[PDB]
């Protein structure tokens with residue numbers, strides 16, 4: 001592995017980007033709060049484990065034409081048990097991307 | 105089993121204490137293709153990866169080079185009989201195949217458990233990768249290994265409240281394996297070496313000449329070298345040819361003698377950052393192997 | 409009783425905020441608070457690689473998840 005990118009980039013209209021992630025959230029049965037037109041707090045109940053996970057979405061402008069959707073995990077407050085806050089954060093992101101987004 | 109200084113030290117330190125400030129962890133979802141998973145171990149400079157079952161929402165096991173070896177051995181054999189599934193196997197489907205009736209759960213450890221519990225767990229489960237998993241968040245923090253534990257021990261125990269057994273030899277402490285040593289020749293093809301790995305459940309094979317003297321070593325770490333090529337067909341070549349593709353200039357094999365103190369052996373192993381020394385006589389004829397597991401099994405039972 | 413008027417400032421969010429609080433777009437792999445943020449390799453051969461660095465106490469782990477699409 002060589003090049004790591006922060007979030008994902010898009011040249012779609014900002015308002016389209018945000019409306020589409022919002023429809024994506026509702027479709028996925030996550031709960032959300034709009035802090036800003038470009039800043040969302042989102043919370044999901046794990047259908048298997050019954051734990052809750054929180055994350056932030058923030059849109060940034062990187063060019064005159066280009067935007068960057070940023071995902072950030074939020075902290076809470078022998079064989080293992082179900083659950084991993086980090087992996088679960090990865091799956092939320094992935095699900096959100098899959099359900100609002102097409103590789104252009 | 106007794107009151108050694110090593111024993112007191114392990115019982116008083118948490119696993120957390122061994123984690124480096126900063127580390128990487130590669131995790132595979134179990135629906136991943138095996139071929140891609142093994143390319144990922146290499147790509148990332150990593151030897152083991154926790155396995156996550158998305159449907160179950162938990163870690164369910166590890167994927168290591170041993171698994172890669174098993175798989176590659178099976179692929180080789182199946183190919184000769186026109187069976188080509190495996191490479192398109194997903195981890196999940198390989199697991200239900202190999203683990204058959206066997207339940208074999210993921211063994212892991214809390215960051216707050218003792219180093220003693222870690223060493224005991226690695227020994228008792230006969231395992232080389234112990235993921236440290238936080239019980240509050242469920243995150244794997246780190247994969248703990250024998251090499252890492254021995255380094256920590258060497259470094260953080262003062263030398264001079266020294267147990268009497270540290271000045272005793274391998275010979276008298278009976279640490280290591282001295283019979284039925286799995287070895288190959290210069291000419292031995294890679295696939296035969298694979299078969300030997302699978303049967304003997306052993307991580308390295310000393311490479312010997314006609315007089316039985318060691319001239320090189322063929323390891324499990326040396327086998328993911330196959331996972332960088334699109335073609336696996338190069339399994340028919342001699343062990344010597346396979347070792348040409350090694351990382352750096354090769355100094356020679358790391359050896360020891362039956363009569364060296366444990367202290368000398370621990371130091372050489374810790375310094376060299378290798379999993380084992382090949383035990384040798386006056387003439388470089390191989391007499392045995394001393395592994396990190398051997399040492400750590402000795403240290404946890406008070407030099408036995 | 410007169411009608412009342414509303415003054416609406418819209419152009420604080422006309423366009424998204426520009427990036428740099430020195431959060432890096434690209435990492436070509438100790439470095440400040442990129443903690444908890446998602447990173448990703450370009451998709452290859454139908455597989456997602458998701459990345460992030462989290463803190464346990466004073467320990468930092470960068471987790472990579474290889475996930476089929």
Ligand SMILES: Nc1ncnc2c1ncn2[C@@H]1O[C@H](COP(=O)(O)OP(=O)(O)O)[C@@H](O)[C@H]1O
Nearest residue numbers: 166167168169170209210211231232233234235
């Ligand atoms: N912590 C663990 N829990 C359960 N199974 C494991 C664990 N670590 C390794 N294994 C499995 O046990 C076998 C032996 O692997 P091991 O000797 O530990 O690793 P390596 O192949 O890196 O030496 C493999 O099939 C591996 O998947």
Ligand SMILES: Nc1ncnc2c1ncn2[C@@H]1O[C@H](COP(=O)(O)OP(=O)(O)O)[C@@H](O)[C@H]1O
Nearest residue numbers: 321323324325326356357358378379380381382
């Ligand atoms: N006794 C030895 N003498 C010389 N080289 C060795 C010896 N043991 C291992 N190596 C080499 O050093 C590398 C380290 O691999 P190894 O110690 O087997 O596993 P690990 O990844 O756990 O260190 C391998 O490429 C191997 O060929």
Ligand SMILES: Nc1ncnc2c1ncn2[C@@H]1O[C@H](COP(=O)(O)O)[C@@H](O)[C@H]1O
Nearest residue numbers: 280281285286306307308309393395397
């Ligand atoms: N090539 C080998 N032949 C026979 N035994 C070995 C060999 N390599 C390691 N061992 C022994 O097998 C056990 C596991 O070693 P390792 O697989 O290196 O952790 C230890 O007791 C070793 O001494």
